[PDB]
């Protein structure tokens, strides 16, 4: 039996830890065959200056930037398998540097010793099913060798994310725009907009979090514009809201309202797209950024082709943890511990989960959701169960921090679910903490 | 019948099209065509667009124009043979035309011939597989309207996509803590951006000098070209330094292989591209680096693994639209049985000639001139309207000196049309100080 897994991010550490947990216990696991783009693992983790285009003109992949610490609480994303105190034997503040998480992250990754099944440098061109023979064909470009090669697959695990090909509007007037224009995706180093006015547009994944890094680091001025919901989070002095973007000219931008602004920079926070070109229409899922895409046997399968799965796919409330849930169910899948209903059966199933996500209006619902839905793949294999309410739960004052003082939240503490140890104060205010390095973060004063 | 898949609609395959076209105008039977563009519109590198690393629809941005580009060469140069200057304008118009007049000028050709029909626009090219058993090529192709991923299939193919679009970046010591933009000259935009700031400019690619010349004109603080090459000749303004090659980067500062340090604002990697051709294998993919003879092509134009794929436009670019046509009009004749191929071992001994003769290319006339009898030699076997290549030629050496006088006023300069022999007007503003780009002030 021969496994793909497309990309090393933490979906495909996943999965390869899934595979070397079962060996680990004593089960004969299949060949394992990980193809990376990147020159290391670490996916979204492994940070670049680079931008657009890598060095083998292939799509920059990392979309994070300096400066950039944990988005939500460390004790929700905290490993179900490996502790923050097992790993750094000191308790430390709940929302670590990019850096800090890093090494948490391959920590254990390197415990369990799966880089020796991954290519890296080596870019999946297509995949392919065989009708004849049941099988897969991987094409894969090795830039290393700038050589172009197939091998044949039975499964094929895609882990290569949905959080790095831009959605990038385009707004009447940018062609004059004297300014600089950018979507998240390209954003690196928030000195780079120092004593500069720049206009935000959007609302997704970091769009509040991109705004507050160019605020700490001396951004004369922000201006957020969205067409979701306004949460009614308590801005700076330097802030302003506006109605959302209908134009712009050499060096202002035009709001609904009729106002408008100079300004020097607009980076669009407006998204991304499940875009797989190395996938023709029999596996390729299309979708938009959801708690529930279909087409997903446990949000997990593909259903026009069982052999074909998707890690990571889902809107990211919950991450790592979910992951591998996710990873546990797959495996066991392939492995034949697992028989997998018909295609009427699943599509049908998948509905009753579609039915359900559309019901959802608050955040602790979809919290609540998904946590459901991780409890239930957790439920079918050997995967150690964790707090999933109490890690809700968590997740919910964070949500509350946020509202009482968005720019002040990351100073606030939580215990973990793993160990119970409630977390320190961290010695620098995050406003103050302009130094992004783990070694800064680990000690003091 | 027979159909032919055309990728790319730049010059290359505007031109593969016109050439198809004007065949049919004298009344021959055509092969159906199909031409696929990723983009909106036609025009290859001279469609701009204000969007860098990835567009609309998640493919990679292709263009690497900027705003306020005008023409490196005299128009004269590179005006169509049976599509004229004074045709499209006219009337008389200066020698170095800003993008938007040459992209006017090129879209004008293809207009008229009524080929937009042919065209499958915001359509990206996936993969091409020759399949033995059939003779026939599968293409894979992604419509970003519809959405959809379909596969047709074809003849011949011929690949104009370009090898200007996907760069070649190298790293330097320090880049991932460096303060400042880091960008290459393929993501270069807007000139404005640099107002005021110090900006450096690394290695000596097409652009370089000529990024240079915008940030400059455009405000720039100062400019440092530093580069490993041969300096390049050119007496440059008070706030521009030449160095010697960049070795580390600090947050603030670049060091340089003279021991010099400076602060820089932004750094520009003027560092090339690559022949980068994503949707085919091994067997069809043309290798090289940039140069005026790439191996494995017959004519500079033939694949001689597989004889029923063509690349146009593959070769670095002293002649530019001429070149495409000649390439066109000879791909064609091949595909419409007009010109049979010698043997595989034959075509490989005629392009070893062609390539031993490009490596005792030891100036830059020479390299033009070579070129120049490259088209002459295209042109020779087809009924493109042949046209005076050694007077081209010496429109070339006047443009190499009026740049070695003086750099920032080469674009100055008037030429002689060798299509209508019309003698350029001096335009109303000199290059300097015109700041305005648009086709309407520049044909005022
Ligand atoms: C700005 C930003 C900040 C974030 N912050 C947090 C946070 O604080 N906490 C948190 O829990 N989550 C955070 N995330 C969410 C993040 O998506 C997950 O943490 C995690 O990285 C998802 O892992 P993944 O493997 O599914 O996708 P990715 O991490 O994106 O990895 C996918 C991998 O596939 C590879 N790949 C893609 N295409 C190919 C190809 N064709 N061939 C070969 N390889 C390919 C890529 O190189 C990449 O390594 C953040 C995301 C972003 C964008
Ligand atoms: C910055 C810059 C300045 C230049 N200035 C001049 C100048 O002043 N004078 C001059 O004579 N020449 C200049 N050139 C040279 C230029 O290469 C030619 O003028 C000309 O554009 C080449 O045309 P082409 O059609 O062969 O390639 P391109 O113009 O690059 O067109 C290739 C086309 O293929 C399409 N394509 C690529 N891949 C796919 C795919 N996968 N699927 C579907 N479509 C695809 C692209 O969208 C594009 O339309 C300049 C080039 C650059 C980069």
């Known amino acids: 039996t021969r496994i793909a897994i497309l990309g090393a991010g933490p979906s495909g550490m996943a999965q390869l830890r899934a595979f070397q947990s079962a060996q680990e216990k004593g089960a004969e696991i299949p060949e394992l065959v990980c193809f990376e783009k990147q020159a290391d693992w670490?996916?979204?983790?492994?940070?670049?200056?680079?931008?657009?285009?890598?060095?083998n003109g292939e799509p920059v992949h990392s979309s994070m930037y300096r400066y950039l610490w944990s988005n939500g609480p460390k004790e929700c994303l905290e490993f179900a398998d490996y502790t923050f105190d097992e790993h750094f034997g000191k308790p430390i503040a709940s929302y670590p540097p990019r850096?800090?998480?890093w090494d948490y992250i391959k920590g254990r990754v390197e415990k369990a010793g799966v880089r020796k099944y991954i290519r890296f440098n080596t870019a999946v061109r297509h995949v392919e099913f065989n009708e004849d023979s049941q099988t897969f064909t991987v094409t894969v470009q090795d830039h290393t060798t700038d050589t172009i090669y197939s091998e044949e697959f039975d499964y094929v695990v895609?882990?290569?994310?949905?959080?790095?090909?831009?959605?990038?509007?385009?707004?009447?007037?940018?062609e004059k725009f004297g300014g600089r224009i950018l979507h998240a995706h390209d954003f690196r180093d928030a000195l780079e907009f120092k004593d500069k006015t720049v206009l935000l547009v959007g609302s997704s994944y970091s769009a509040?979090?991109?705004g507050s890094q160019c605020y700490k680091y001396g951004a004369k001025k922000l201006i957020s514009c969205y067409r979701t919901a306004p949460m009614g989070y308590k801005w700076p002095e330097n802030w302003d809201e506006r109605p959302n973007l209908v134009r712009v000219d050499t060096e202002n931008a035009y709001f609904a309202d009729g106002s408008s602004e100079?300004?020097?920079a607009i980076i669009l926070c407006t998204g991304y797209i499940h875009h797989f070109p190395f996938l023709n229409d029999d596996l390729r899922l299309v979708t938009n950024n959801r708690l529930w895409p279909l087409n997903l046997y446990k949000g997990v399968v593909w259903e026009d082709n069982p052999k074909f799965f998707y890690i990571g796919m889902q809107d990211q409330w919950y991450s790592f943890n979910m992951f591998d849930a996710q990873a546990w169910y797959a495996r066991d899948v392939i492995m034949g511990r697992l028989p997998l209903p018909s295609k009427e059966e699943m599509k049908a199933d998948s509905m009753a989960w579609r039915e359900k996500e559309l019901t959802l209006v608050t955040a602790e619902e979809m919290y609540t959701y998904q946590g459901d839905y991780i409890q239930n793949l957790i439920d079918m294999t050997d995967y150690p169960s964790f707090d999933i309410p109490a890690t809700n739960k968590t997740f919910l004052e964070w949500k509350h921090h946020?509202?009482?003082?968005?720019?002040?939240?990351?100073?606030?503490s939580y215990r973990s679910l793993m160990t119970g140890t409630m977390a320190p104060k961290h010695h620098t205010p995050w406003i103050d903490a302009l130094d992004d390095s783990l070694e800064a973060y680990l000690s003091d004063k």
């Open 42 to 55: 670490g996916g979204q983790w492994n940070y670049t200056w680079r931008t657009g285009l890598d060095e």
């Open 402 to 412: 946020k509202k009482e003082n968005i720019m002040t939240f990351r100073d606030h």
């Open 262 to 264: 100079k300004v020097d």
């Open 208 to 210: 509040e979090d991109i």
């Open 99 to 101: 850096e800090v998480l």
């Open 158 to 174: 895609c882990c290569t994310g949905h959080f790095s090909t831009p959605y990038v509007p385009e707004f009447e007037g940018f």
